[PDB]
Design a protein around this ligand. Structure first.
Ligand code: 8YF
Length: 265
């Protein structure tokens, strides 16, 4: 954590914003922590926890995941790359969950939020697994304003990492649901230039990205399975002071590398 404190401070000076990282080695329990308790906008990264919340309630409602959902043109928000293709047919809850995780589909996300009782419902789920930091307040795309100092629709890298470990590796989800959750994340298509880019080919990895765009705000959280040791869980979030500041996928990848090197690769 101190082996990387000055490399991190330099990386974020080159970026021109702020970088929050929390990484945990599930074996030794070693952690690496940089701005890990600061709040960062979640952007689309709430969609992973959305799917986990849906999986949780499929433990009470049999057939939830295969329930068909029908929706109108008015449900199609900018960047709905999957749900726009099934507008005239509809989609199952599992297909919408997969779309939200693997393509960061915004209409799918908002449809799933409705089923859960909106942002308060998802926040309620996160409280039930012991996360007191997470808050979702708004819908796509309003949630992505990324205003400096605004606590709405934020969490911390450490809370994100801790909740992810509970849902992917711990006991927050029953074992069928937990494996489904992990599979959706492993099939994510939007994270090739972020945490995955810090990861060698022979490692298994599931992630979920977030890209507010404004205020140089983007993120990525991931469970990483090295060959021959325990999985690593980590979260990398960024933000920047000016609305037109650009986010950097390379900066996220670079913080992921520093976190893995900090834990002992
Ligand atoms: C446009 C907005 O919904 C954005 C967000 O709020 O985060 C969506 C769209 C997308 S852009 C995905 C582009 N990926 C390219 N490889 C992100 C993301 O990065 O996860 N989520």
């Amino acid at each position: 954590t101190n082996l990387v404190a000055e490399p991190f401070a330099k990386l974020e000076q080159d970026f021109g914003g702020s970088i929050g990282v929390y990484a945990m080695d599930t074996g030794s329990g070693a952690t690496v922590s940089y701005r890990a308790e600061e709040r960062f906008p979640l952007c689309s990264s709430f969609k992973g926890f959305l799917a986990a919340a849906v999986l949780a309630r499929s433990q009470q409602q049999a057939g939830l995941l295969d329930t068909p959902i029908r929706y109108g043109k008015n449900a199609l928000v900018p960047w709905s790359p999957i749900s726009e293709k099934y507008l005239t047919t509809g989609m199952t809850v599992a297909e919408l969950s997969a779309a939200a995780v693997q393509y960061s589909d915004n209409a799918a996300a908002n449809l799933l939020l409705k089923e859960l009782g909106g942002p308060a419902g998802l926040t309620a789920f996160m409280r039930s697994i012991g996360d007191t930091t997470f808050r979702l307040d708004r819908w796509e795309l309003e949630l992505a304003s990324a205003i400096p100092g605004d606590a709405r629709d934020t969490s911390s890298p450490r809370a994100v990492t801790e909740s992810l470990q509970k849902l992917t590796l711990g006991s927050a989800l029953a074992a069928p649901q937990r494996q489904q959750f992990v599979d959706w994340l492993k099939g994510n298509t939007t994270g090739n230039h972020r945490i995955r880019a810090a990861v060698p080919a022979d490692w298994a990895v599931g992630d979920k990205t977030g890209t507010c765009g404004v205020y140089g705000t983007a993120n990525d959280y991931a469970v990483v399975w090295p060959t021959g040791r325990a999985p690593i869980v980590l979260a990398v979030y960024t933000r920047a002071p000016n609305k037109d500041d650009k986010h950097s996928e390379a900066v996220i990848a670079a913080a992921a590398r520093l976190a893995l090197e900090g834990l002992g690769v």
